[PDB]
Structure formats: C-alpha cells, structure tokens
C-alpha cells in the first residue's frame, strides 16, 4: 500500500505515458552501480587486456 | 653415481634452474624473476672443497616425476629446497613433509628481513638469508649450504 492518495489518474486528465516513462527512467537510474579495477600481487600478473 | 639436488618448481622460489648454477657454483646471486625460465630440468654443477682433493660433480633436478623412476635414485639425494608448500611432496618418496625432512636435508631460501612461513618453522629445515642490497654475503651463504651438503656426503661415505 504505497498509493495512499486518490489522485485522479483519468487518461484524458492525466499524462499517463509521460509518468510511465519518467518512472521507468527513475528505475533505470536506481539500477546504477559502482565498480573499480582489481589489483593482484603476483610476479607473472600484469594488468593488461587480452590483445595486450 | 653423482648426487642429486632437488629444487622447488614453484615460481616464488628464490633458487630456480635459471640461476642455480651461478648461485651454488659461481657464488653470485641473481634475481630469478628477472632471469628467463630454463627449459631443461637437469643441470650439472661443480663444487670445489678443501675436504676433497678433486672437484665433485653434482646433478640438479627440478622435477622428480620423470627422473626418479627407480628407488635407488633417492639414495643419491643430498639436499632438498622447498618453498614451504605442501603440494611439492605429492609424488615424493615420503609424501609427508616431516619424515622427508628428518630423512633428508631441507633448505629454505628467503630474503633478509622477511618473515618465515609457519610451515617452515614447524619443519626441520635450514634457513638461509640473502640480502637484497649487499652482494658480498652470497659466497658466505653458499659456503654454509655446501658445508651442510659436504657434512652429509662425508657422513654417507661417498666415493669420488
């Protein structure tokens, strides 16, 4: 029970599609994550790509 | 029958097949990480000692899987170099490190100032320290190693 307000979401009186697009973009921004490189100490280890 | 010296095939070993000859024989220590890897697992070195009139020829073997098919080869082993790893001894004569180290001479090479591994302290092996900067003590460390090896050889009454 999140929608506790009786907002008049009539299709002729409410921009349903823009709300859906904005909410989808807000979920697509909540999917953002943080990442970083890995450091390993080994004599034969080198931080290189496959071709490198 | 020349005696056999067994080295650890681990990449973290300070003594490898690339620089074992120049270290044990010539008395100069070079970093094995910078030296290229050696394709041959068998090498021959010469030791000059005051206890013996003639130089002694010794064979250095990295892997015992292809060179110790006969049990009589283990009678020629006079020194074992280990890195403190249990998996070195899967195919050895004594799969338990303890019995192997009471029945054979164990040597561990570490840089001066580094901490000894826990397994090394729990085993009967000698600890030899190589300084990172000063290079004059390499001959002294090699002399300690060869003193232990020659004591074992005289105790075994080897003929040369």
């Amino acid at each position: 029970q999140v929608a506790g307000l009786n907002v008049n979401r009539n299709p002729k009186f409410w921009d349903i599609e823009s709300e859906n697009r904005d909410r989808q973009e807000e979920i697509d921004k909540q999917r953002e994550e943080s990442r970083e490189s890995r450091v390993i100490k080994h004599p034969f280890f080198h931080n290189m790509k496959s071709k490198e | 029958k020349e005696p056999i010296i067994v080295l650890s095939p681990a990449a973290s070993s300070l003594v490898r097949m690339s620089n074992v000859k120049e270290f044990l024989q010539e008395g100069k220590f070079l970093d094995p990480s910078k030296e290229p890897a050696s394709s041959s697992n068998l090498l021959a070195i010469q030791r000059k000692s005051s206890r013996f009139k003639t130089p002694i020829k010794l064979l250095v073997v990295d892997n015992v899987e292809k060179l110790f098919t006969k049990s009589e080869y283990w009678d020629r082993v006079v020194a074992i170099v280990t890195t403190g790893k249990d998996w070195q001894f899967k195919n050895y004569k004594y799969k338990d490190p303890q019995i192997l180290f009471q029945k054979f001479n164990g040597f561990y090479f570490k840089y001066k100032g580094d901490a000894v591994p826990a397994s090394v302290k729990s085993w009967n092996v000698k600890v030899l320290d190589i300084d990172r900067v000063e290079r004059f003590s390499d001959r002294q460390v090699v002399e300690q190693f060869w003193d232990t090896v020659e004591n074992t050889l005289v105790a075994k009454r080897y003929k040369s």
Binding site: - | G27, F136, S137, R139, E143, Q144
Partner: protein, 113 residues
C-alpha cells in the same frame, strides 16, 4: 675506542671459510694492495664532491684508516691470518657495511644525551 671490530671480522672470516690447514693461498699481493687502498676511500662520512667536503672526509677517517692499514697488511694477511680471495672480499665488504652502520643518525638529540 674505534668502530668496526677488525679482530672479530677476521676470526669470523676464518671460521666461515675454513682458513685452517697449510694450504697455499691464491690471493695475489697487488689484489691485497689495491683492495685495502680502495677500501680506505669508500668510508663515507660525508657525501659530496666539494674540495672542503673531501678534506673533512679524509680528516674524519684518519685514525680508522690507520687501524685498518695496521691490521690488513700484506705480510699479516698472508702469514698470520692466511686469508684467500673469497675471505678477503668478504672482509672488505663487511668492513664497508659495518662502517656505514656505525654513523650517527640525523635527528639525534646528542645534547640531552
């Protein structure tokens, strides 16, 4: 009182390299002369190339160089101590390293001491 105990270094070299027995030495006389002479110019107390720095450096090590030359003499090395080549190089390197370790450290509060 002087730094770097030379007697201890010599007997350590004798014990390490087994300098007993009447075996002849392979240590040539020019090697001894040049080794001692070069050792007496690597005992760095002060670093730099200025002439005053070199004069102060030569002044600071006069007594220790006298001690080293009195001990590491050619006849003494060949007859009393009976060093070989490896023992000689080990003694020279050990003398240099131990002299480097005996210098005072900057930041010492020598006044309070």
């Amino acid at each position: 009182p002087l730094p770097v105990n030379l007697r201890r270094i010599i007997q350590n070299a004798q014990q390490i390299f087994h300098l007993d027995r009447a075996k002849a030495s392979d240590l040539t006389i020019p090697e001894i002369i040049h080794g001692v002479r070069d050792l007496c110019k690597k005992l760095f107390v002060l670093r730099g190339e200025n002439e005053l720095i070199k004069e102060a450096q030569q002044n600071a090590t006069s007594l220790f160089q006298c001690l080293v030359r009195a001990r590491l003499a050619t006849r003494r090395i060949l007859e009393e101590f009976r060093l070989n080549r490896d023992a000689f190089e080990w003694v020279l390197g050990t003398i240099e390293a131990q002299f480097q370790r005996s210098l005072v450290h900057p930041g010492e509060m020598v006044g309070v001491i």
